[model samples]
Target chain A: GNVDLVFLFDGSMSLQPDEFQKILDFMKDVMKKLSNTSYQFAAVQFSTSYKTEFDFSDYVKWKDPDALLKHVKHMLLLTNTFGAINYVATEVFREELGARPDATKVLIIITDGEATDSGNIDAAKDIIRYIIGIGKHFQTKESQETLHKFASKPASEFVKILDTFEKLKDLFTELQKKIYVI
Target chain B: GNVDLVFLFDGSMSLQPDEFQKILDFMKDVMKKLSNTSYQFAAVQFSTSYKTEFDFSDYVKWKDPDALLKHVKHMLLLTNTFGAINYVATEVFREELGARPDATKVLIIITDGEATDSGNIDAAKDIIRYIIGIGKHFQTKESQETLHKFASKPASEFVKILDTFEKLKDLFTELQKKIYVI
Candidate 1:
């Protein structure tokens, strides 16, 4: 069975154009690693509002990571993360999105975690939620606590934190490696 | 289109049977009103952990709201308001639960606000998010702030505070008024 992957991207106020593109580039590279693994991809960019750029069915139809990449845009607004995750789970990973009920489901949320509303990210039970916290503004003590609290159990592995977006270069490469084994 | 009401019940440690009944009774009457308006009731109770007792469609078909009333047991616990709300939005208010895409959605959260962990609750845009803070533990300034923070805009109408669980009778009566208008 293939892995049904959903990417929850943060394009809220804290993210600028360069950083947003950097994050998207990182994700595109990660998708490349899944080429041989029969992985399906779905994506939604969120802040105060969210837009589904691509779903797994689109991925299955186009079989191109660029289908998602072409739609990534940076917008500044409040981060209504928990709402977005709910959409991702109920809308993005459903059978309509070409997600398999019996296959392995994965949710990768790319957020600064730097908002007043630090959205909740409980395990979907059916999906493995990995939260990648990037940027200098993201890793405050309280935010980290919230991130850890919302992440799937064994927070150490699934809850990742990085110093800056510039450092996103190798993070997903290694993350793809983990996905290979995951 | 009618309404789909999901009660995010606080099963956190602060609640007791007496107070819990206040909330349940309040909801029961509200459901009674829905008899004319056409509504479905679903509930997810949470503290450190969470459970979905019954979603609207399931309860409406096989059993009455009494089935939910029978299961509304109270044990004290912490708070994960956002996590529970997220689950209700995704798991409870979708097709599997007989939730329509174009129905008036409502989420009523019953909590004392006694949570060491405050989960985010900003994604409840489509649904009318109401916080019913009942019991003595709920009056603290901080809890009220958290309630107001998570609730929808125009906080006054959406955020309801009461003296104790015993106040459930009229609160829901008035709340039903707001629901009808909203």
Candidate 2:
């Protein structure tokens, strides 16, 4: 399916520089795997607030992975996942930003732990969200349930729990297969 | 997939006898459609408490639909969904009661609205649940969300909302397709 894919990266200080870089590398891998022209990609890195690292317009113009990813940087702050999701729902996926009206809106969130503050997901109700929880912090029952609630329904397909950033690399094939069905 | 299926009916005072009968007829239709030998059936009607309407052994011995459903009766009391789920997890699907160890466990809940009281689903964590809400009460945003919460993950496939009990008859084809995937 044609998709307008948005990557919501957690850039809190809790995530080390090396771990953050691993996520960037993983996103680069994802772009390469889903190189279909129909897939338009965008990204936002969030902590206390969120910053659009790149939008669909940027991806459409640069097309090259290195060029698109070069300026992206991590903002180490408090995690506010709810606000970031609302921002993406209102600003990033707008038609003016090159988000296709016809393409499926897909959001992929990579977070290390629970949010410092809770927020509503009502804003992004139309988007199919895939949540990836990284690290052992999510091993706790509360955090695990939070991860499930964050993703779109039928979480068996949309939620992925990873032990470490390294495990994200092995997700390419499985992730690609699910996106194909979308 | 081979399945050990259980029907949890809402036998509370709020549900009219005719409406309760509609759910029973729906279950009968489901049995006819999934008549494979590998599929075992059981039922429980819940209000203030739950009563085992039948067991897996009962279905096996009296394979005929009329014979199996003859003695089933509605108990008009108060709705206690949580307790009913707990009962099914601990008592209904036991190996001693003809619950096959190898079969996939599936629970189908038919209710008109929200539970009168809250309860935990932790006991039935291994079971895949399908929740069907009948009537306009579920049209409210809160009730709709509650219905989604009751069903197993990937609510798209496990949850169905009907305007009335009459619509339950139309669910046969769609429901069978999902059960087949199990």
Candidate 3:
């Protein structure tokens, strides 16, 4: 059950220049939670073109948590309005992480605005459909549900819904005990 | 956002050898935490072949928790031990719930043993791979991750050794959070 996680950050110009620091802070907090695990982190910042801010292998040598934090801090939030998110999947995740056989590949995207580029929605739909098809192969039932739920809404809406659901702390606590059995 | 879960129970002689009631109890406990939302349940008990113990529509009328619990109690546990899980996925899930675009489709399997007959792990792998392949056709990065992660495993002791220096607990906790967030 080793997890390979990819962090996709929204580096769009619409984000408050001053608030950009908070974005890095948020990532720092997220990464801090992941620092002690076997989980690999790949950072991608998007605006005009989807850039590989950091690759998965880099985390092995760049183990210093503070260094990773600093790297995020210096990253500029630019505008790549032309590049679609699907481009990141094809060029980055599929080509990069997809090559790895054992690790569980994930691209965690943190975006601010709606996908303005053409074919973005269709591309997103294809992603969900693909997950369902793949999950069926793995016999991972939960995967199907997760993909369906995620594909149902915009990324921002999905985030807000998750934040609200997280407020039900007791539910998670109970669910955690169940997962322990698994 | 209600979750549509299909509980695929293995009713083979091996599974029913002991107290079959324990399995039902475990399922009820899992369902208790999901009370507030609009959720759908479909039950399929399989041994040599798969059979719908209860269809998706059957549960719709049993809204009350007690009624649902009673239904679970009365259901006869079958002992069909000669089939692979892939059969359940292709025959049971695909037939009953595959086309449900409105609800998040999930197959929750409870099996004491591995695949028995007519189940090819390779076929399952191919099915999942095909799902990912089709996903590549889409453009959204977030959707792609959702699909990909559906097949990813939870952290295990074995993964700890491969990753070398990472803690497994944090990886597991992070994975659980991610799964629940979805």
Candidate 4:
């Protein structure tokens, strides 16, 4: 089965300059490894507003990593992650984006603990949502629970907690191995 | 049939004080009508964050309109309607809130065009969404389309356009009739 994956990353003020570069690399690395026939990539970055950086068909536009990185670097901010998730639910899964009825839809939300639980994800019953929390602020019991509640249920599997932004680069290898299980 | 209805409002700097108060009254009026059951009501206000002011079960907690209006008046923030919509989808439309599988769920978004076409609302398929853009700012072609796209298909019927906050209260009568067409 093919996977239709979308990345919702936090480009908020909390994500600092140097750390954003690492996040960019994290995206590039994940895309590099998952750029196989089994997967298609779509992305949006958020803050006060969201910009649909690329759609599923845009994966072809990102034939090279640099082109994708250039697009990735353009993500905006504000911790309105729940809204970004809403945008993904509404616009990202349409036919033009290659959202397939049979394809497994995956949403990977990366944030610096800026947003909280917004709503449900019922556009399709089968979406697998993962929440990755980065930086020092994401260390609290409350913060972890927010991530727990946001991601697909049984949050233990869907959530990745990073104490610092530097560790984001390390998740690439794990996801690369994990993505094809679909 | 029973209904689980939610109102998502804009509480941004873009909304003037007089306008916001009128918006409050409109909520109050709708609550007055729908509070009698087979309707349950929930509300959240958005800007940078979406706050769950009250839910359906709170009808007992509200006892009357004054209590609910007091709460609605306090829902502060930025105008990220997309984020608020996400909250309604994931957390709001759940069992604890009395959102049932059989109830006709409706989400009515009220904004003054402060937040326009920022993204998608696909997470809530069962929700019959309606968008009301208040004030003169919503007159632009782009603004009306944003409301149309945010609402369900056959958008012309689901969307309400108000030229000023003064006209906001007038839409409640029509809502009472339209809330349960199913």
Candidate 5:
């Protein structure tokens, strides 16, 4: 069975343009590692609201890595995480992808800053609850400030970004193993 | 803060008379083991219908083992399990016990057979989902097939009853650990 994965990225202006590009590069590599036919991927970028950066089917069909990198490099910064999270829930989970078959639906939220807008925390919690209510599990990364306090300066920032990808890759690999067993 | 633990017993006619008595004894022992100021016990029995054999607050003023045992023993087992499960979801979870503040609500169902009437499996899933949905865990025991095989009595009936209780006790212990950690 194919698993449906949704990557929800945080593209606020706070994230350095170069840092954002790094994320996309890492994602392209990840896609390569996961080129097996048993899984699909979708990308949603959240700045002030979530926008479909790339649908799963379209991303899967992109045979050229350079073109995929170019598409990612041209992404603009957006600033509404609260609205984005809610948008994913209402439009993505409830409408666009609601009828997905018994596949494992993964919602991966990648963010760089604390929610600047009001009500985003509550919205995030609601989205998490809905996922669990529908028999799915949720995962989260620690705040950037917490990571920085633990490891000071540019090294800390670099570690935080790399660690997020590492954690996400591990999670995806685990889910793939579970699908194989099933 | 105190925790309220409720036991939902399956008192079906198919359960052997002696085996039923054994179950009562086991309940008494479990309560005795948990004789603590932080924990309280209540019991409800359902076969074809649901009834509060013992109310949550009833155990607060009284802790006598004999009286508690008698109250549980007298709970009528006339209702089928399907109705009982639904009653717990609507009447117990939604109304009676749902409003308890700062308490870990526990519902344990002990059945000896599959649902005998309408809405059995759905009712079971609903109640389990309700409990887990609200951060409460629900537990169930596999019934002894030889004793109450909905068909005819088998030779291994006694072993089945014994095995069922062993599994129940193990589950109860695990629940205790979960609540303790929380």
Candidate 6:
């Protein structure tokens, strides 16, 4: 099956620079697995606005995934996760850009805080959502519910929590396995 | 540039069985060029509704170009060309289905008659529309203008004609060159 994997990350000011690099490393490992396969990959860093580090065409051009991943600089602003997701669904994941109709859609959203935007997640229709909530921000019951809301059905399988940014690497393999089996 | 080439054809009642085969052959030649490259391919046969013969993932699966093309059975109904285009843009050319954000989008529409759809083509944003008008239906001034409206900027470069279905073979190379140069 063909897969379109989009990494929609929170780049708000609260996330430390070091923690961001750790997230990048975790994404790098994911890219390593995609090196030999035809799985299409793209990353969107969202704060106030969405910044496309690289799209599917960029992945095709630079088969070595880290090359483009390294260029993704953090945007120190508000965390607009919902708006960014909407942007990816509407603009980024278009056929002209590199989307396929027959492939499975996987959206992996990484964020440390709640969404600042009032947008709805209903726009993400039919796509699998894997929610990664990191640090103390997601430890609360409210945040946990939010994480579940952001993810697809079977929250246990689609939702993952990282105590801190450093713990992100540990979830990499587990997430990869989930995508591999699907 | 990475390209997602979609063939949206008219599979309505007016298209003769023999003529439909010519369109398939023309599409086969386009797939032949995609045989060695990473360019993604998909096809939709639209009349009253839309039928997906294959998508980028199917292209990846069958690789041998004609393998999936041979499986496409014509849908004999009304010519809902606009509805089909909208469906491709919103549903088919999606991220989960294998669409890449940075890829250049190309929609090649092959039809023998005017669209019977009441739907508008405004949904196909940012995609390059190449309208291929066939037979006497497109020879009129009104039809010619409609073709221009269906295409992207610079109508001369994005539109083509075939006097009949048999002449579709001649337009293959020309279409290929247009795609190749882009």
State the lDDT of candidate 6 residue by residue for B1-182, as single tens digits.
Answer: 56787889888888889988888888887676445454678888998989888888877767766778777788888888778889888888877667776887889898888878665779897898888889888888778777676778788878787788877766653443233111
Highest lDDT among the candidates is held by which one? Answer: 2
lDDT measured at residue B155 in model 4 versus the true structure, 0 to 100: 74
DockQ of candidate 4? Answer: 0.01
In candidate 1, the second chain superimposes onto the true chain B with a TM-score of: 0.86
**Candidate 1: CAPRI quality band:** incorrect
The i-RMS of candidate 6 is 15.1
lDDT of each: 0.72, 0.81, 0.45, 0.72, 0.49, 0.78
Error of 6 at A11 (Å): 0.5
Candidate 5 collision pairs: A47-A78, A47-A79, A47-A80, A48-A79, A48-A80, B47-B79, B47-B80, B48-B79, B48-B80, B49-B79
- The reply for model 6, stretches above 4 Å from the true place, is A176-182, B1-182
lDDT of 1 by residue, A59-106 (tens): 877877876579566768877777887778877878866888777788
Tens-digit lDDT string for candidate 3 (A1-182): 44566656666666565445555555555555445454566666777667676666666667554576565533344544335346555665553443244655555555444444543434434332111111012234443333333343553333322222123343333333332111
Which pairs of residues collide in candidate 1?
Answer: B12-B76, B12-B77, B13-B76, B13-B77
Candidate 6 chain A: minimum summed lDDT over ten consecutive residues — where? A173-182
Could you give candidate 3's per-residue lDDT for residues B20-114 as a string of tens digits?
45545545544553443445666666666666665555566654434554544322433333343455455544435432446445555444433
Candidate 5: CAPRI quality band = incorrect
Give RMSD to native, each candidate. Answer: 22.1, 16.4, 17.0, 22.5, 17.9, 15.7
List runs of model 4 lying over 4 Å from the truth. Answer: A72-76, A116-120, A176-182, B1-182
- CAPRI classification of candidate 2: incorrect
lDDT of 4 by residue, A52-162 (tens): 877877776565555865745534446876677778888997777767768778898888865733655566345788888997887787778877756887877888888
Candidate 4 lDDT, B15-88, residue by residue in tens:
77788888778887766644434567787777777777777767646646567657455345557777678889
Across A55-167, the per-residue lDDT of candidate 6 in tens digits comes to 87778778676688877878889988778888888877877777777767889998899888875778898788888889998877878887687789898888887889877
**What would the DockQ be for model 2?**
0.01
Q: Estimate the lDDT of model 3.
A: 0.45
DockQ of each: 0.01, 0.01, 0.02, 0.01, 0.01, 0.01
| Chain B structural similarity (TM-score) per candidate | 0.86, 0.92, 0.52, 0.86, 0.61, 0.91
